[PDB]
Symmetry: none
Subunit: 140 residues, 10 copies
């Protein structure tokens, strides 16, 4: 009446007969309390920095002129390992300027012109004021 | 043979009641209380920074002119490992300028490259240096 | 060999035998109360920063002129690990103007004795005939 | 003839077990109260920042001119790990200006990652003929 | 002093010839009250920031001119981990000028627009393998 | 820290207390009252920020000109973890003008028929039903 | 006067119960009153912010000009975790200018058609210009 | 209706209502009064903000010009977790200029396959199943 | 003869403080409690930096002019391993300019003809026995 | 040769099996508690730097002029191994400038003045006639 018939062959279901039992493991003391690790009075530090700066009098910074970069005071960094092409780990004042362009120079093709005489003939010289037109009872 | 008198049965008498001959396993310890780990008086720190700056008088910053970048005071950073091409971990004042535009040339070909040679017979060719030493001192 | 008569002192013990009492144990015990971990007097810190700045007098910032970037005072950062191309972990004053670009140099920069040399593309040939008049201006 | 069937066992008035036979009768100290973990006097901190700034006199900010960016005062950040291409963890004053630029359609990187490089003896193929032992040598 | 030492409250305890040889009778002690975890005097903090700024005199902000961005005062942030391409965790003053308008490209030329279906080269639904014939792309 | 007045420690074996005697150790019971967890004197904080700013004199903000963005005063944020491409956790003054990326995804597919450039009136004659009858009277 | 607990037969008893009696012999505790958890002196806070700002004199805001965005005063936020592409957790002054396209998309037009009868509207209550037929249709 | 007759020994307490009973005065020695949890001296806060601002003199807001957005005073927010693409948790002054255009929310739809006809191939098998010709009797 | 010996004729050096302890004795046991590792009084540090700078009087910075870069004060960095082409681990003041080199002409600080101050000790070219070229020509 | 290789099954004397039993620990003590490693009084440091600078009087920095780079004070770095072509591990004051000849013209000596104040329209007609056809298939 079963929907599907089944048959045994190799009988692979648990030949090892594994079970929670130790052969002749019976004893007064078995499986003692394992001890992990003990740490007493130990100091561990990884990646730590501390900087202290004290200034009483004045620095006196009148006129300062620097082309590249300038760093004053105190700088501290804590690192272990670093990797990278063209990479920088610790750098005080970093400035890069480039402008090679095409590595070529050429004179200006333009800069040319031609004669353009307006040939002035008006002696009026603008002069908006004092109009030659004399109207009746001038508002001015 | 007879002198052996069997074994563990020499008495072959005594009493069976209240014999208490068997240990009955009165004392038996199994699966003791496992002990993990113990930590007493331990300090652990990872990635920590502390900076202190004190200024009494004045700095006196009249006129300051810097092209690139300038950093003053105190800077501190805590790191362990860093990776990245062109990457920067710690940099005080970072400025990169690469202006590119306006080109006089406009011909299809930027240049003809006159540097056809790939193995110059000059410069490197010049090898006036001698591998041998000026003075001779061979050991027989 | 009477030598010395008397000298009775058998009271003094010269052997351990078994004159020692044992302490009472826990007797029968199964599945003792497992002990996890114990922590007493322990300090743990990860990623912490503390900065203190005190200024009494004045800084005196009359005229300040900077092209790139400028950072003054105190800056502190706590980090452990960082990754990323072109990435920056700690940078005081970051300014980038324009950019060159990126090229994997797909074209063959170098070649080993090419039997049939060929330009990347285009490869436009030319022949002599007439030179362009656009050049010098020899009026007389 | 036993007058008393009970056997005058009035001495006993309690029964903990019947006939004794291989009866261990444990039921003693089983499943002790497991102890989790104990914490006494422990400090734990992750991702914490504290900054203090005190200014008495005046800064005196008359005229300030900066092209890129400028950050003054105190800046502090607490981080553990960071990842991202072109990403920035801590940056004081970030400014990027691009007058001329172009994107490679955001095409994927070649990532050749060659694992089979070729670099043998590379002996010079060319072999110009030279006078001496070879051919005829009447002059020498 | 009613017995001169070894008296008063001292009489006798335990020590029996044989009477009461049986201890109590039976003990259950099953399923002891399990103990979770105990916490006494412990401090835990995750993601916390505290900033204090005090200013007495005046700053004196007459004329200020900045192209990019400027941040003054105190800024503090508490973070543990961050991830994201082009993402920023902590940045004081962020300004990006991408702008628009590309005159470099100028008028179109190699547009090669998809024309109407003509002589289809995709006979098969799946696209052809890019690999065909090559072995001079690396050449170390 | 600056070391402790306690002195330099290199051993100082921990003090161990005698077990003395065990309090009974057997209550003779089943299903003892399980003990959850005990908390006495514990501080827990997650995501907290506190900022204090005090200004006496005046700032003196006459003329201020900034192209990008400017943030003055005090800013504090408490976070643990953050993720997102192009996302920003903490940024003081964020301004982005235009973007290099483009390539519009094209106009949405809805049809220009959605417009009504002719016969604005519609469904005016249509009114077979209104899915049930209901009263209405908008405020006026 | 508050009784902490009631003692049982504290005073010495003249006689003791006879163990011979079977009634009310012994009683083992079953199902003890389980103890949940105990909390005494504990502080818990999640997502809390507190900002205090005090200003005596005046700020003096005469003329202020900012292109992007500007935030002054005090800003504080409490968060734990955040996720989202292009999302922002804390940002003081956020402004993004896309300006997709440009003004007057249509190319210059000399108004090929002076008239423009589109999107009819009531001219009632409106008379920006004289509109109608030039015909006067004289009575006679 | 208006029942008043009482049943003799007929009435009986149900097990439904009897299921629920007060937990007090229970039987002693068995089923001790379980103890829930005890809380004494505990502070709990989740999502709380408090801001205080005091101004004596005047701000002096003569002429203010801002393109993007500007926020002055004090802003505080309390949050724990936030999620959403393009979402913002805390932002002071948010302005986006993009012709009120939409960025199209939601993930992209699958590519366009066929108009309607399908040609299953991954369904090929030793005994392909025929599709019912019923097709829900489509109008077609 | 003169040989001396003890009354007991003992041929062994005297010893004190047996210490004993660590006696395994005789008893059954299986799976002893394994012992991990023990750490008592140990200091471990990796990647740590500490800098302290104290200034009483003033620096006196009147006029400062630097072309490249200048760094004053104290700089300290902690690193283990670094790798990268063109990469820099620790650099105080980094500035690179690649726009247009000037005509920095300059003559060499050394350039003389090989006069050969010392020559082989040849008797033919060296005649210490005779001073000068004077020729002997005595009248007698 | 000799039919039936089998033979010499019976030993002349004694047994072939080893007297000693393999894999001991059959009982008594087996699997002793392995001991990891013990560390008492040990100091380990990797990558650590410490610099201290104290200045009483003044430095007296009147006029300072440096072409390349200058570093004053104290600089210390801790490293183990470094690799990279053209890479620098520790360098105080690094400045590199290009050195190209040319520069024949374009000197600042020449002044540039904008001509044609009226700025007349130029020839922007960059669309010359070019050969090309929609279809190409000569029938000849």
């Amino acid at each position: 009446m079963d929907v599907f018939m089944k048959g045994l062959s190799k009988a692979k279901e648990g030949v090892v007969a594994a079970a929670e039992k130790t052969k002749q493991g019976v004893a007064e003391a078995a499986g003692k309390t394992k001890e992990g690790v003990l740490y007493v009075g130990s100091k561990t530090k990884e990646g730590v920095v501390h900087g202290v700066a004290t200034v009483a009098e004045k620095t006196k910074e009148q006129v300062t002129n620097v082309g590249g970069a300038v760093v004053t005071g105190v700088t501290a960094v804590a690192q272990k390992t670093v990797e990278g092409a063209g990479s920088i780990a610790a750098a005080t004042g970093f400035v890069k300027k480039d402008q090679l362009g095409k590595n070529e120079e050429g004179a200006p093709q333009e800069g040319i012109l031609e004669d353009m005489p307006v040939d002035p003939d008006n002696e009026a010289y603008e002069m908006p004021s004092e109009e030659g037109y004399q109207d009746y009872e001038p508002e001015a």
